[PDB]
Amino acid sequence: MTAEAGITGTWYNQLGSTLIVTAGADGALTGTYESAVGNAESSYVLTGRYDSAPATDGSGTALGWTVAWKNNYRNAHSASTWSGQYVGGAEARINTQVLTTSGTTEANAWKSTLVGHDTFTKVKP
């Protein structure tokens, strides 16, 4: 029932976006993020961390990851970070909150960062 085993694979958000992630035995998250819209276009590299020895008292597993919105096809001069927890079981979820910062002048820094939320499931919407 390990968090390593549970997190590794493909997840889909409410908006249709696809997360493909491998959770390493010692806390690494690596993979890609594709489709719908943070500020997207094809696949982007994703990296993060998770608690590889979580509590076994029914608590979720803390994690986070980052995508910089630059690949071979697009550069949005922005990066998003998702912070959340994985909940296992038949109805598994990654529940997140997400910050998206765009590069700005000092003057526009006040409007540099968006906040949203993303819920990921194992099955498509």
Side-chain angles (χ1 to χ4, degrees), residues 6 10 13 24 36 47 55 73 76 88 90 97 106 119 121 123:
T10 305
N13 82 343
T47 191
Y73 311 96
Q97 283 179 279
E106 170 200 296
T119 306
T121 56
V123 202

Coordinates of all heavy atoms in Angstrom, one line a residue, residues 6 10 13 24 36 47 55 73 76 88 90 97 106 119 121 123:
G6 N 1.5 3.9 -4.7 CA 0.3 4.6 -4.9 C 0.4 5.8 -5.8 O -0.5 6.0 -6.7
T10 N -0.3 7.7 -13.7 CA -0.9 8.8 -14.4 C -2.1 9.3 -13.6 O -2.9 8.5 -13.1 CB -1.4 8.3 -15.8 OG1 -0.3 7.7 -16.5 CG2 -2.0 9.5 -16.7
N13 N -6.5 15.8 -13.9 CA -7.2 16.9 -13.2 C -8.6 17.0 -13.7 O -9.1 16.4 -14.6 CB -6.4 18.2 -13.2 CG -6.7 19.0 -14.4 OD1 -7.2 18.5 -15.4 ND2 -6.4 20.3 -14.3
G24 N 10.0 8.0 -6.4 CA 11.3 7.2 -6.2 C 11.2 6.8 -4.7 O 10.5 7.4 -3.9
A36 N -4.7 20.1 -20.9 CA -5.5 21.3 -20.5 C -4.7 22.5 -20.3 O -4.0 23.0 -21.2 CB -6.4 21.0 -19.3
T47 N 9.2 18.1 -11.7 CA 10.0 17.6 -10.7 C 9.5 18.0 -9.3 O 9.0 19.2 -9.1 CB 11.5 17.9 -10.8 OG1 12.2 17.2 -9.9 CG2 11.8 19.4 -10.5
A55 N 2.6 9.0 7.6 CA 1.9 8.4 8.8 C 1.0 7.3 8.3 O 0.5 7.4 7.2 CB 1.2 9.6 9.5
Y73 N 8.3 23.9 -27.7 CA 7.2 24.5 -28.5 C 6.7 25.8 -28.0 O 6.2 26.6 -28.7 CB 6.1 23.5 -28.7 CG 6.5 22.1 -29.1 CD1 6.7 21.1 -28.2 CD2 6.8 21.9 -30.4 CE1 7.2 19.9 -28.5 CE2 7.3 20.6 -30.8 CZ 7.5 19.6 -29.8 OH 7.9 18.3 -30.2
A76 N 6.2 30.3 -21.7 CA 5.2 31.2 -21.1 C 5.9 32.2 -20.1 O 5.2 33.0 -19.5 CB 4.1 30.5 -20.4
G88 N -4.8 7.6 -0.6 CA -4.9 6.3 -1.3 C -6.3 5.7 -1.3 O -7.2 6.3 -0.9
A90 N -9.6 3.1 -3.1 CA -10.3 2.8 -4.3 C -10.6 4.1 -5.1 O -10.7 4.1 -6.3 CB -11.6 2.0 -4.0
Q97 N -3.2 22.6 -3.9 CA -3.2 24.0 -4.2 C -2.1 24.5 -5.0 O -1.0 24.0 -4.9 CB -3.5 24.8 -2.9 CG -4.9 24.7 -2.5 CD -5.4 25.4 -1.3 OE1 -5.1 24.9 -0.2 NE2 -6.0 26.5 -1.5
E106 N 9.5 44.8 -11.8 CA 9.3 45.1 -10.3 C 7.9 45.8 -10.1 O 7.2 45.5 -9.2 CB 10.4 46.0 -9.8 CG 10.2 46.6 -8.4 CD 11.0 47.8 -8.1 OE1 12.3 47.7 -8.1 OE2 10.4 48.9 -7.9
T119 N -7.5 19.1 -8.3 CA -7.8 17.8 -7.8 C -7.5 16.7 -8.8 O -8.1 16.8 -9.9 CB -9.2 17.6 -7.3 OG1 -9.6 18.7 -6.4 CG2 -9.5 16.3 -6.6
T121 N -7.4 12.7 -10.1 CA -7.8 11.3 -9.9 C -7.1 10.4 -10.9 O -6.6 10.8 -11.9 CB -9.3 11.2 -10.1 OG1 -9.7 11.6 -11.5 CG2 -10.1 12.0 -9.1
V123 N -8.7 8.2 -12.8 CA -9.6 8.1 -14.0 C -9.9 9.5 -14.7 O -10.0 10.5 -14.0 CB -11.0 7.5 -13.6 CG1 -11.6 6.8 -14.8 CG2 -10.8 6.4 -12.5

